[PDB]
Amino acid sequence: SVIKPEMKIKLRMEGAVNGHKFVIEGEGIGKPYEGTQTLDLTVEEGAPLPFSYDILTPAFNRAFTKYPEDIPDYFKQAFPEGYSWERSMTYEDQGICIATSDITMEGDCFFYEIRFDGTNFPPNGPVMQKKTLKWKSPTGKMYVEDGVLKGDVEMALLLEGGGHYRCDFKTTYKAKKDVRLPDAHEVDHRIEILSHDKDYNKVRLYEHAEARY
Numbered sequence: 571s572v573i574k575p576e577m578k579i580k581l582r583m584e585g586a587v588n589g590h591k592f593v594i595e596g597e598g599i600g601k602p603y604e605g606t607q608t609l610d611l612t613v614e615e616g617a618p619l620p621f622s623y624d625i626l627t628p629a630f631n632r633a634f635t636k637y638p639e640d641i642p643d644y645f646k647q648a649f650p651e652g653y654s655w656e657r658s659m660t661y662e663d664q665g666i667c668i669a670t671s672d673i674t675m676e677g678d679c680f681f682y683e684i685r686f687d688g689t690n691f692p693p694n695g696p697v698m699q700k701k702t703l704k705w706k707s708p709t710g711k712m713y714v715e716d717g718v719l720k721g722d723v724e725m726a727l728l729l730e731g732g733g734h735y736r737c738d739f740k741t742t743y744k745a746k747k748d749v750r751l752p753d754a755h756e757v758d759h760r761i762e763i764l765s766h767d768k769d770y771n772k773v774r775l776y777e778h779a780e781a782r783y
Contacts, residue, residue: 572650573602573633578679579609583629585686587667588698592616596630598775602646605636605780608764611773618769621691622702624727627761627775628739629657629669629686632721635757636780643781644719647749649675655743659725662736665691696727696735703728705761710739712781713754719743721757757781 579598586592593615600607609630613619637643645653652674659667667688674681691697710723721741726734757779764774 571646572675573646574678575601575603576678577602577633579607579631579682580679581609581630581682581684583626583682583684583686585669585684585688587619587621587625587686587688588691589689590616590620592619594626594630596775600634602633603636605634606778607631607634607776609773609775611775613771617771620698621688622697622700622727623763623766623770623773624702624705625659625667625688625697626686627705627763628659628725629671629684630775631671631673631680631682632743632757632779633673633680634777634779638781641755641781641783642750642752644743644745644749644752648745648747651746653743653745655741657739657741659688660738660740661691661697663692663695665689665695665697696729701730702735703730704763706734707758707760710757710759711754712752712757714751717751719745719751723759755781755783 581596583594596609596611598609633645654672669686672683706726723739725737759779761777766773
């Protein structure tokens with residue numbers, strides 16, 4: 571396989587949230603067959619971000635998923651050539667984000683080109699007021715629709731003061747080459763900011779993900 575037991579990551583995200591432009595770069599490393607990875611992320615333009623960092627973190631690669639032998643691994647099969655994804659993230663208070671990622675590989679490193687746009691977040695809502703704690707860890711669904719792999723997951727951010735704030739995720743995946751398509755299955759995720767500096771100009775971000783029926 572071209573996917574090694576350890577793979578490096580390099581990424582660049584550009585985008586805007588409620589008009590505020592930014593650029594974030596990341597470098598990391600993970601274990602694709604164990605479903606784990608860590609990224610160090612830096613805000614290169616647009617600091618300090620005036621919105622919750624948490625809305626960005628699932629945009630910062632399902633190749634880092636432990637797949638059982640009897641479920642075809644769409645993501646690892648997609649390499650060396652790579653794959654892209656398109657995602658809508660529809661929050662309960664009418665804030666909306668849409669993001670795209672083009673994922674390539676060279677040697678022992680993945681590269682992501684990420685576009686992230688978000689609008690219509692209420693000025694006094696939990697995103698613009700930075701009242702979010704972390705993402706809950708739901709089970710997502712993977713399924714194929716007429717030869718295309720899709721993902722849906724009902725997400726939620728925990729809030730300061732004990733509440734929750736929901737978001738519907740819908741993703742479409744596109745391998746650059748034809749690969750074996752899996753049957754419908756699930757993916758468990760946990761994503762966590764491990765460390766950050768005061769205004770999240772520096773962020774260390776971890777994900778563990780595993781597929782199952």
